[PDB]
Amino acid sequence: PPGPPG
Amino acid sequence: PPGPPG
Amino acid sequence: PPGPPG
Amino acid sequence: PPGPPG
Amino acid sequence: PPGPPG
Amino acid sequence: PPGPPG
Amino acid sequence: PPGPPG
Amino acid sequence: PPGPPG
Amino acid sequence: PPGPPG
Amino acid sequence: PPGPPG
Amino acid sequence: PPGPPGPPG
Amino acid sequence: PPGPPGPPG
Amino acid sequence: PPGPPGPPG
Amino acid sequence: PPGPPGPPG
Amino acid sequence: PPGPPGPPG
């Protein structure tokens, strides 16, 4: 899955 | 695994 | 079978 | 056997 | 993460 | 997200 | 932050 | 925001 | 600040 | 503001 | 900035 | 960034 | 990535 | 493989 | 033989 928000 | 933070 | 998600 | 992780 | 102050 | 006001 | 005095 | 009156 | 006296 | 009267 | 001078006495 | 200067006195 | 700068004060 | 980077903050 | 790699994270 995509990573977390910056 | 999940990707890196934005 | 295919492996697990990354 | 199952394949490697993605 | 949140950006810098204006 | 955008940072805080200056 | 707020600007300087007038 | 703008600063205070002079 | 207020200006000088007249 | 303008200063005081002379 | 400061305000302008006041009026004459 | 900081805001602009305030108004004249 | 980090977000952009915030608004002027 | 790992996922892609997340969104901007 | 082993299976193929799994899906992206």
Q: Which residues of A touch M3 (CB under 8 A)?
A: 6
Reported in sequence order, the residue ranges of N1-9 that DSSP labels E, i.e. its strands, are: none
- Cα distances (Å, whole numbers) of residue I5 to C3, G6, N6: 86, 19, 62
> Resolution of the coordinates in A?
1.6
Whether chain E lies against chain C with 3 or more Cβ pairs closer than 8 A is no
- Beta-carbon contacts of D1 under 8 Å, excluding residues fewer than 6 positions away, are O2, O3
Q: In whole angstroms, give the CA distance from residue J1 to residue I1.
A: 7
Whether chain J lies against chain D with 3 or more Cβ pairs closer than 8 A is no
Residue with tokens 């900081």: L2
Task: Answer whether L4 touches K (CB < 8 Å).
Answer: no
Q: Is O2 exposed, middle or buried (0-12, 13-18, 19+ CB in 10 A)?
A: exposed
Buried b (16+ CB within 10 A) or exposed e, H1-6: ebbeeb
- Max intra-chain CA distance, chain E: 15
Our CA dihedral for O4, O5, O6, O9, rounded to 10 degrees, sits at -160
Technique used to solve these coordinates: X-ray
Cβ-contact N8, M1 below 8 angstroms: yes
Chains J & K: contacts with CB separation below 8 Å: 19
Q: Is K9 exposed, middle or buried (0-12, 13-18, 19+ CB in 10 A)?
A: exposed
Chain A stretch 1-6, residues whose beta carbon is closer than 8 A to a beta carbon of chain B: 1-6
